Amino acid sequence: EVKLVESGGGLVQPGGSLRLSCATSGFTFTDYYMSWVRQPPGKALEWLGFIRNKAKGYTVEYSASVKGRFTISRDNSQSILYLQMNTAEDSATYYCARDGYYVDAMDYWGQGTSVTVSS
Amino acid sequence: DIVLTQSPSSLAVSAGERVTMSCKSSQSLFKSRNQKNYLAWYQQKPGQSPKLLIYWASTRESGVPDRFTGSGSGTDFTLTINGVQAEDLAVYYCKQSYNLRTFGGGTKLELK
Ligand SMILES: O=C(O)[C@@]1(O)C[C@@H](O)[C@@H](O)[C@@H]([C@H](O)CO)O1
Ligand SMILES: [Mg+2]
């Protein structure tokens, strides 16, 4: 049974930093890519970036919207994905999802974690 | 910078009837290599996490009911729901995986 679980979301304020976590299981973690997708309340899904698998070298990719400010890390021994957010529009529900060049899609998703922004 | 336009923004139907929705890409998502269309459809029920319905334009994911059918290639793609069920109330996103990943605006399906 595949599992993805996001956590580490809450209230913050622009310029600040927030660390998001995605504990996984039920599959060979290192065999798959891992993408982060967000969704502002009542808006569309937005792909933020992913980190490739074992054969690819765990290299990372980003969307122009978050590139630089955001960074994506993974723990190949514990099978946990990370989204290190740095620095009003970033507010949203944050989903981590299993990705890869097998089906070229995110075939498994977490339940997301809410990130708000209030002074 | 790939742009996927989904049409229409929203639509409503009764349970049991047939619906189609469009996903047009500003760039071809077809790779001559493996001869695959790097487009996928995602179903998102209200207040729930997105689910993969179809990949490679026309390939149905495991567990997905046969009433969902993806079609098209290049820049024109279509999602067809044959005999809509109440469970189908959701927002349907098309997503290009040709270069990185990009989501369409999404099409919200209502069931009255
Ligand atoms: O960036 C990737 O490593 C990746 O392999 C993801 C695949 O889904 C696919 O999009 C691929 C491009 O199509 C280039 O081949 O890039
Ligand atoms: Mg699968």
Cβ burial of A8 (10 Å; 0-12, 13-18, 19+) is middle
Nearest C-alpha of chain B: how many angstroms from A112? 7
- Please say whether the beta carbons of A48 and A2 come within 8 A: no
> What SS3 class is residue A30?
helix
**Paired residues of A63 in beta bridges:** none
- What are A28-32's contacts with CB under 8 Å, separation 24+? A29/A74, A29/A76, A29/A79, A30/A54, A30/A76, A31/A100, A32/A98, A32/A99, A32/A100, A32/A102
* Count of domains observed in chain B: 1
Phi-psi region of A84 (alpha: psi -120 to 50; beta: other; left: phi over 0): beta
What is the residue range of A71's domain? 1-119
Taking 3-state DSSP, the helix, strand and coil percentages for chain A, each rounded to the nearest 5, stand at 5, 50, 50
CATH at B102: 2.60.40.10
Give the span between the Cα atoms of B86 and B63, in whole angstroms. Answer: 17
Distance A28 CA to ligand 2 centre (A): 13
What residues in chain A have their Cβ under 8 A from chain B's Cβ atoms?
Answer: 35, 37, 44-47, 49-50, 61, 63, 95, 97, 99, 103-112
Q: What is the CATH number of the domain that holds A2?
A: 2.60.40.10
Q: How was this structure determined?
A: X-ray
Using alpha carbons, list the distances in angstroms from residue B21 to A26, B9, B75, B98. Answer: 34, 9, 14, 21
Q: Which of B94, B62, B72, B68 is nearest to B83 (CA)?
A: B68
Count of the separate structural domains present in chain A = 1
Beta strands in chain A (DSSP E): 3-7, 11-12, 18-25, 33-39, 46-51, 60-62, 70-75, 80-85, 92-99, 108-109, 113-117
Q: Is there an atom of ligand 1 within 6 Å of A51 CB?
A: no
Question: In which domain, by residue range, is B21 found?
Answer: 1-112
